[PDB]
Design a protein around this ligand. Structure first.
Ligand SMILES: COc1ccc2c(c1)OC[C@@H]1CN3C(=O)CCN3[C@@H]21
Length: 282
């Protein structure tokens, strides 16, 4: 079926939970043996969210190459994304090592450091120009260059220096700051505006390594971001845009990381975002 009328048909019939459970039943199951090794317990935030072995990002290290991060490679859309958990106190150096080694231009953050009165990720970037951060375990230096605070999101320019070679690179930090503590946003307008700002920066384009996108577990809000982006791109590429099947795209993405889209409300919100976005594109 088309999307917008499939949408109203699920609303009128109140069957979002059944649609979402079908997706959970059909989703791929691949091994995640490296994630479950005892030496990696303090590298995982949640015991039930792990990268598959076949698609995990490897650190360029011989001691321990493990990080909780996955490469989502979308062949028809010609887009790739790295989805990862919010960094932990003992993985902030690994996080920036990955950004460096994968040649990423942008980092997309979809959570606040504290939500619901609890810590959802480490404070992993510097808040003042004159107070830079040094990650001694991976030999990197990180400096805040500029910050632009808007009503729904903040953009930061950061300098990452490989202290071993003295090479430097400019990284863009795109921080969506207004996702509610509970539920999903009422309108997709600010999320779509944010997606378009990431696109306009070059951070999603083939001349750079894959964008790094995270929330707390790296599957829920993060899944919504890449699902909406890929669906909108396919609608621009194909002769028949009504042929784009958001459930089929989501199942394709779940071949590369488990659990993408965590609730039926997040599934409905993803439909809404793609539907509204397809009108603005034209
Ligand atoms: C309903 O809220 C929105 C907000 C923004 C957009 C949208 C819908 O649909 C796709 C449009 C494409 N466009 C740009 O290129 C910049 C933002 N804007 C997008």
């Amino acid at each position: 079926m088309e999307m917008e009328k499939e949408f109203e048909q699920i609303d009128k019939s109140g069957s979002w939970a059944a649609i979402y459970q079908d997706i959970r039943h059909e989703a791929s199951d691949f091994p995640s043996r490296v994630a479950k090794l005892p030496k990696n317990k303090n590298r995982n935030r949640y015991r039930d969210v792990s990268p598959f072995d076949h698609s995990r990002i490897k650190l360029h290290q011989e001691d321990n190459d493990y990080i909780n991060a996955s490469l989502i490679k979308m062949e028809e859309a010609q887009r790739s994304y790295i989805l990862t958990q919010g960094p932990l106190p003992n993985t902030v150096g690994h996080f920036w090592e990955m950004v460096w080694e994968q040649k990423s231009r942008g980092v997309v953050m979809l959570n606040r450091v504290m939500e619901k009165g609890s810590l959802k990720c480490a404070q992993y970037w510097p808040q003042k120009e004159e107070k830079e951060m040094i990650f001694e375990d991976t030999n990197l230096k990180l400096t805040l260059i500029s910050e632009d605070i808007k009503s729904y999101y903040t953009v930061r320019q950061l300098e990452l220096e490989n202290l071993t070679t003295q090479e430097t690179r400019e990284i863009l930090h795109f921080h969506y700051t207004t996702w509610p503590d509970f539920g999903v946003p009422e309108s997709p307008a600010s999320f779509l505006n944010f997606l378009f700002k990431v696109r306009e920066s070059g951070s999603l384009s083939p001349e750079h390594g894959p964008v790094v996108v995270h929330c707390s577990a790296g599957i829920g809000r993060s899944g919504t971001f890449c699902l909406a982006d890929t669906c909108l791109l396919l609608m621009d590429k194909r002769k028949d845009p009504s042929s784009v099947d958001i459930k089929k795209v989501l199942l394709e993405m779940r071949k590369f990381r488990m659990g993408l889209i965590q609730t039926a409300d997040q599934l409905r919100f993803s439909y809404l975002a793609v539907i509204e976005g397809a009108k603005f594109i034209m």
